[PDB]
Design a protein around this ligand. Sequence first.
Ligand SMILES: N[C@@H](Cc1c[nH]c2ccccc12)C(=O)O
Ligand SMILES: N[C@@H](Cc1c[nH]c2ccccc12)C(=O)O
Ligand SMILES: N[C@@H](Cc1c[nH]c2ccccc12)C(=O)O
Ligand SMILES: N[C@@H](Cc1c[nH]c2ccccc12)C(=O)O
Ligand SMILES: N[C@@H](Cc1c[nH]c2ccccc12)C(=O)O
Ligand SMILES: N[C@@H](Cc1c[nH]c2ccccc12)C(=O)O
Ligand SMILES: N[C@@H](Cc1c[nH]c2ccccc12)C(=O)O
Ligand SMILES: N[C@@H](Cc1c[nH]c2ccccc12)C(=O)O
Ligand SMILES: N[C@@H](Cc1c[nH]c2ccccc12)C(=O)O
Ligand SMILES: N[C@@H](Cc1c[nH]c2ccccc12)C(=O)O
Ligand SMILES: N[C@@H](Cc1c[nH]c2ccccc12)C(=O)O
Lengths: 69, 69, 69, 68, 67, 68, 70, 67, 67, 67, 68
Amino acid sequence: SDFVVIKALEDGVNVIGLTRGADTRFHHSEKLDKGEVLIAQFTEHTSAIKVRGKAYIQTRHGVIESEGK
Amino acid sequence: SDFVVIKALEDGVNVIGLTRGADTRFHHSEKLDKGEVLIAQFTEHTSAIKVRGKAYIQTRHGVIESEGK
Amino acid sequence: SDFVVIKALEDGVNVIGLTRGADTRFHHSEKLDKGEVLIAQFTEHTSAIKVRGKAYIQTRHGVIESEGK
Amino acid sequence: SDFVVIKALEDGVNVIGLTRGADTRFHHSEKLDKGEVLIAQFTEHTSAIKVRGKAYIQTRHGVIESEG
Amino acid sequence: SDFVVIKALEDGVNVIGLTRGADTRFHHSEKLDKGEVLIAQFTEHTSAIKVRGKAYIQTRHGVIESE
Amino acid sequence: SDFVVIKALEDGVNVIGLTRGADTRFHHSEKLDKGEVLIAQFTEHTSAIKVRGKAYIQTRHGVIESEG
Amino acid sequence: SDFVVIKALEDGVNVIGLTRGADTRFHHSEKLDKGEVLIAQFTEHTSAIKVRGKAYIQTRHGVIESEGKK
Amino acid sequence: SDFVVIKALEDGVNVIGLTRGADTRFHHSEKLDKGEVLIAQFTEHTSAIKVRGKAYIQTRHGVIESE
Amino acid sequence: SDFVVIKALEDGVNVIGLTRGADTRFHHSEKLDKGEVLIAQFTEHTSAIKVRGKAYIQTRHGVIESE
Amino acid sequence: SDFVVIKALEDGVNVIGLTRGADTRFHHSEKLDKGEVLIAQFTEHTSAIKVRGKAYIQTRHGVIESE
Amino acid sequence: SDFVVIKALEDGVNVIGLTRGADTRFHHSEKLDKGEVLIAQFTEHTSAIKVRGKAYIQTRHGVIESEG
Ligand SMILES: N[C@@H](Cc1c[nH]c2ccccc12)C(=O)O
Ligand SMILES: N[C@@H](Cc1c[nH]c2ccccc12)C(=O)O
Ligand SMILES: N[C@@H](Cc1c[nH]c2ccccc12)C(=O)O
Ligand SMILES: N[C@@H](Cc1c[nH]c2ccccc12)C(=O)O
Ligand SMILES: N[C@@H](Cc1c[nH]c2ccccc12)C(=O)O
Ligand SMILES: N[C@@H](Cc1c[nH]c2ccccc12)C(=O)O
Ligand SMILES: N[C@@H](Cc1c[nH]c2ccccc12)C(=O)O
Ligand SMILES: N[C@@H](Cc1c[nH]c2ccccc12)C(=O)O
Ligand SMILES: N[C@@H](Cc1c[nH]c2ccccc12)C(=O)O
Ligand SMILES: N[C@@H](Cc1c[nH]c2ccccc12)C(=O)O
Ligand SMILES: N[C@@H](Cc1c[nH]c2ccccc12)C(=O)O
C-alpha cells in the first residue's frame, strides 16, 4: 500500500491523517520537530494526508515541499 | 489505489471529492492555505477529485498547475 | 483502476460520463471553469468520458488537448 | 482495463462499439464534433471499437490517425 | 486483455476473427475502408486475428504492415 | 495469454498449432498468402506453434524470420 | 510489503513504530547506536515509522537523512 | 506462462519435452527442419525442454545457440 | 517476498530477527564470521532485521554498510 | 514460474535436481553432451538445481559459467 | 519465490538452509566443490540461506562474493 516520506525543516510541523469513508475529518495529528522524518502509509483508517508547516516530502510521484506560515 | 498530490500556491484552495456511484455530487471540500500539501487517494467514497484555486499538482500521469479565476 | 486529468482552458468546459452497460447515455455532466482541474476515474457507472470545450488532458497514454467551436 | 483516446479532427466522427461474444454487431455509435475528445474503455459489452472519419487516436501501443 | 490496432491503407481491408477452442474457423469478418481504424481485443470467442489487404498494424510487439 | 505476430513473405506459409496436453499432434494449420498477417495466441488448445515457410515473426522475445 | 533502511549516524537514534488502526500511539522504540542498521517493514501492527536522531534512511522513494534532536 | 523460441539452423533439429512431476523422462520430440521455427511453452505436461541440433534460441533471459 | 544480503566484514557480526506481531523482541541471533554471507527474508516470524557489527548490506533500495 | 538455461560446454555436463520439502536430496540428474541446451523450471518437485561440469548458464539474475 | 545463484570458487563450499518458522536451525548443508553452481530458492522450508567458503553470488539485488 503506498506511503509518503516527510522531513520537518522546522519545529512544529504537522502530519494530519484524515478518516477513510463517508465522513472526512482529522483523526490524528503527529508533531515533527526540525529534522525528524515520518514515514507514513495510506491505510484502512487513513485515505488522505495533510502536511502543515515547512517540510520536505517524497512520494511515488516525486519530491514536493510544503511551506509554513 | 492511486493518489494525487496538491500544493496550495495561495489561500483558500479547495480540494473537492465527488461521490462514487450512480449519484454524483460533492461530498467534501478540504480547504488548503498557501504552502499546505494535501495527499489524497481515490477511495470507496471518492471517484473524482476537483481542484479550485491556484495549486501545484502531481499524479501518476504528470504535473499540472490549477488556476483561480 | 485508471483515471484521466482535465484542466479547463476556458469557462464552461464539460466533462461527461457515459453509462457502463448494454446502454450508452450521458449520466452526469461536470462543468469546469477556466483553470479548474478535474481528476476522474473510470468506475462501475462510467466506462467512457467525453470532454467538450477547450481542455488540457493527461492520461496514461500521454497528453492531448480538446477544442470546441 | 484498457482504454483508447479519440480526438475528432472534423465534424461527424463516429466511435463505434462492437458487441462482445459469439455475435458481432454495432451496438452504439457516439458521434464527435471537431475538437471533442472521447476516452472509452473495453467492457463487458464492448470488445472491439471502430472509428470512422478523421481522428487522432492514442492507445497503449502508440498514436495513430484515422481518415474517413 | 490484449488488443490490436489496424488502420486500412486501402479500401476493402478485411480483419477476420478465428474461433477460440478445439475447432478453428472464421466467425466474423470486419471490412475496413481506406483510413478507418479497428481496435480489437482477444476475447472468449476470438483467439486469433487475420488481416488481408493493405494495413498499418500496431501491437504489444511493435508495428507491422500487411500487404 | 501471450501471442505471436506472423507475416508471410511468400505464398503457402503455414502456421501450425500443436495440442496442449499429454499428447502432441498438430490440430490446425492456418495457411497464409504473401503479405498476410496472422496474430495468434497460446490458448487452452494450443501450447506450441510451428511456422513452415518464409515469414517475419514478432514475439515477446523479439523478431525472427522463418525460412521453409 | 514495503520496508525502510535505517543506519544510525550517531548513538541513541530511535526508530519508532506507530500502531495501525483507529488509534495512533508508539508501541515500540528500537534504539540504534552509531553505525547500526535497522531494516524494517510496514506490517499488521505498524503503519507509520518515526526516526529520532541523526540517521541515513533508504526507502522506495529515494534517500533521506534524519537530523531530529535527541 | 512462459515459452521458448527455437529456430533450426540445420535439418533434423530436435526439441524435446521432459515430463513434469516426480518422474523425469521425455514424452515428445518435435523434429525441426532447417529454417523452421517452433514457439513452445512450459505447460502442465512439460517442465523442462532439451534442444539437440544446431538451433538459434530466444528466451526471456536472452539469446543462446545450441550446437 | 523480500530479502536482504549481509556480508560480514569482521568476525562476530550479529544478524538479529525481530518478531512480527504486537510485541517486538529478538527471536533469533545469527552470528557470522568475516567473509560469510547470510541471505535472509522477511517472513511470518520476522518483520524487522537488526545488524550488529561491520557488514556490507544489499537490499532492493541499494547498498549500505553497518559499522 | 522461473527457469534457467544451461548450455553444456563439454560432454558429460550434469544438471541435478534437488527435492522440494523438508528433505533435500537429488532425485534426477540429466546429462548433457557438448553443445546441447536444457531449459528447466523450478517446480513442485524441484526447489534447487546443481550444475556439474563445464556449462554456460543464463538465469533472470544474469549469466554464469560453471567449471 | 526468488532464488540465489552460488558458484564455488574453492573446494568445500557450504550452502546452508535455515528453517522457516518460529524456530531457526540449520536443516541442510549442500557441499560444493570448486567450479560447481547451485541455484537455490527460498521455500516453504527455507527462509534464510548461509554461505560459508569463497563463493561467487548472484541475487536479484546484484553480485556479492563470500570469502574463505
Ligand atoms: N473520506 C474521504 C477522504 C478523502 C480521500 N480522498 C479525498 C479527496 C477529496 C476529498 C476527500 C477525500 C474518502 O475516504 O473518500
Ligand atoms: N459518481 C460518478 C462520478 C464519476 C467518476 N468519474 C466520472 C467521470 C465523468 C463523470 C462522472 C464521474 C461515478 O462513480 O462514476
Ligand atoms: N455502455 C458502453 C459505453 C462504451 C464504453 N466504451 C465504448 C466504446 C464505443 C462505444 C460505446 C462504449 C459500455 O459500457 O460498453
Ligand atoms: N464479438 C467479438 C468481436 C471481436 C472482438 N475482437 C475481434 C477480432 C476480430 C473479429 C471480431 C472481433 C468478440 O467478442 O470476439
Ligand atoms: N481454435 C484455436 C485457434 C488458434 C489460436 N492460436 C492458434 C495457433 C495456431 C493455430 C490455431 C490457433 C485455439 O483457440 O487454440
Ligand atoms: N502437449 C505438449 C505440447 C508442448 C508444449 N511445449 C512443448 C515443448 C516440447 C515438446 C512438446 C511441447 C504440452 O502441452 O505440454
Ligand atoms: N493509526 C494510523 C496511523 C497512520 C498511518 N499513516 C498516517 C498518516 C497520518 C496520521 C496517522 C497515520 C493508521 O493506521 O492509519
Ligand atoms: N519431473 C521434473 C523435471 C524437472 C524440471 N526441472 C528440473 C531440473 C532438474 C532436474 C529435473 C527437472 C520436475 O517437474 O521437477
Ligand atoms: N526462522 C526464521 C529464519 C529467518 C529468516 N530471516 C531471518 C532474519 C533474521 C533472523 C532469522 C531469520 C524465519 O522464518 O522467520
Ligand atoms: N513487532 C513489530 C516489529 C516491527 C516491524 N517494523 C517496525 C518498525 C518500527 C518498530 C517495530 C517494527 C511489527 O511486526 O510491527
Ligand atoms: N528441500 C529444500 C531444498 C532447498 C531449496 N533451497 C535450499 C537452500 C539451501 C538448502 C537447501 C535448499 C527446500 O525445499 O527448502
